[model samples]
Target: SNAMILITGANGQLGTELRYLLDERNEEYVAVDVAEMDIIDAEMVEKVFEEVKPTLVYHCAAYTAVDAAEDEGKELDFAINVTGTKNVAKASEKHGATLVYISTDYVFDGKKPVGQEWEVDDRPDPQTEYGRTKRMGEELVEKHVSNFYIIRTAWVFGNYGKNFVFTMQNLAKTHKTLTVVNDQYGRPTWTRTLAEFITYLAENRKEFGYYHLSNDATEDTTWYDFAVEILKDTDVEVKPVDSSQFPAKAKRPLNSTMSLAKAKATGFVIPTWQDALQEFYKQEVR
Candidate 1:
């Protein structure tokens, strides 16, 4: 018998992409968001779990405002990232469902030298409110559920949501020249590829643990590098600049690149960033 899968944040990039991938494989799942099932409400989450009784749960919902999280979004961020995640974890544990939590590379302080990739077992020292809250969520998952896969990914972009790729492409249309930060470095990940990876792991019953999943770039690249690739076809000229010029309320890590050595050891093939971007362009952009 096929396992019943439950997906939260169905409208987000990862969730939307996962839905399409699962459907392509003729898999049945229950996808929900705040409307159908508010994750912050433990009762609602438990009720939904009782009704669906899923064997696998994808906890993709999150509070993703990086800069805004520093100011007006702190409480809400903690409520969702920490409290909401605990609710999902508790329900998954109670119902005997394996939970798959989508985490971020921001859990690290980014103090590592350029080109250094963070391993799955590296100590977490989150700098910003968003990162701290997410780290707290990871802790909650660990505390509540024994059967869980915490996938830490970064530079996520896809057709279903607003992302760095789309932001750069939109800027290129009107702006003659764009200045992007070159100090920060990390591997970019395509949501489609990530979705496929998660599905593959679930299907094969991969082991439960933390995994740093990202596009297999030979070396880490800056946002400027990604913007250059994204706008290569456009007329806009991208200029590399220091992070100081574009100061924001929230501080970002200089090196968020994550090591995929652990993920690869599980026998899953992760595609390169260049190849994944090409597919994104072919399928969605052009």
Candidate 2:
């Protein structure tokens, strides 16, 4: 009964959850993925917008392969994250539609203290190629759209997609011993929780700006801790190792937590990571 919403990246974890949550609700949402529509083409995206004339546009399509981006240069990542998103933002601006762009906590340098809250105005000192390109995408959206919501999330997991949760679940089922990096730290956001927040924002539509979207409670855990949390369910043995032991081309932030005060002030709703994780474990694992 509300405004029509167009969600790009419908096949992704978050996009799938948005459809699952909003399909039978009071909202009207049209979900599309690259297989259905290539948002990399600005003219094509604009054509879709013209056809649907949606009031809200959820831009969830992005370059998510972190390790792969390391092998591929920043040029390839920029093509999808920066240029493709620019196409969406431009179209949203042209259509006078509110744009909701999904970003990441990696935009931060990740050097902030434990339990530190990242603010909106913090000049991004992205440490990885994925972060840099997504930051550029954020810039393009913020620059192009008058009314926009930039939701920077972290450690996304879900049942239907390939994320940390699926990875750990598979590894736990297969491997006996797992060596996990214990250096990087951030909140693990469930796709369903993030999807709910997206719908909530579209309904409210009163607040406008970039805001960090993560669990309310700070879960300062390394990848080692993350693996252990999964191991609690399976019989896999996990070992905690220093990030330096696992050398990578990309440099991960030791800390990438974000503040929720700004989001709360904007009338956005969020939940604790722990509570969401329980439901995720039950639904996906149990």
Candidate 3:
């Protein structure tokens, strides 16, 4: 079974955790960042494909600055998230490589009533510039790649880069009291679970199409809920406030909680966010 694997956005949070999983298992993969290959250029991507001849490709490179995507990073967001994805789709389609692409909950407008999770078949109505482009990437992958797995997650936190977990913990060090938006609701995801799910989908030869993946929870949760659990042991006072307190350029979904039923149908075990957070703390010992 000779299979060449390629990982894009090798330096990002999800990509780094994915690499860690592959590296720990001694799996061979060609990981590349923008420094090595500019995904915006079709020729560059084609050249890398010629060299790697990848059989499985996990596309993780993306412009994730939600607020900045509104005005400042609009063009760059489209360039990387849309055009770059098109390039990858082109190469992967040509080579018959199985593609694993990550998406976000932001795709959904989150207008559904409380306690009603977004199913796999839900229509996407992305509001933010970042979400809009990411949706375009999904469309491109569907149009170009044959064997493709599109997984959408939310409130991502990981070991390699900045996220809400780090932000809260960092703030706790200095600020005794902090205010977080309680109105906005979504699930928190650890990079580890997502990376595992990505590899699991490709390796297991699961059904190729769209699926939503995120840490499970007992009930609908908000940023305030996440922050409380994050700093449970700290002396910091976490206060719950509405989204009105902190105005953001990007209009986030009031509730983007996605249903994991489709993913669970695959028989892969998923941990709750609380347990996932605890697991993160174990490795996050600073």
Per-residue CA lDDT of model 3 for 188-270, tens digit only, reads 99999999898888889999999999999998899999999999999999999998898888998998999999999999889
Estimated TM-score for each candidate: 0.97, 0.92, 0.98
List, residue by residue over 44-124, the lDDT tens digit for candidate 1. Answer: 999999999989999999999999899899889988899899999999999999899999999999998887789999999
Model 1, poorest ten-residue lDDT window? 277-286
Q: For residue 16, what is the lDDT in candidate 1?
A: 92
Query: Runs in model 1 with CA error above 4 Å?
Result: 284-286
Candidate lDDT scores, in order, read 0.91, 0.82, 0.92
Model 3's alpha-carbon lDDT is 0.92
RMSD of each: 1.4, 2.2, 1.2
Model number with the top lDDT: 3
Scanning candidate 3 in windows of ten residues, the lowest lDDT window is 277-286
Backbone collisions counted per model: 0, 0, 0
Residue pairs with backbone atoms closer than 3 Å in model 2 (clashes): none
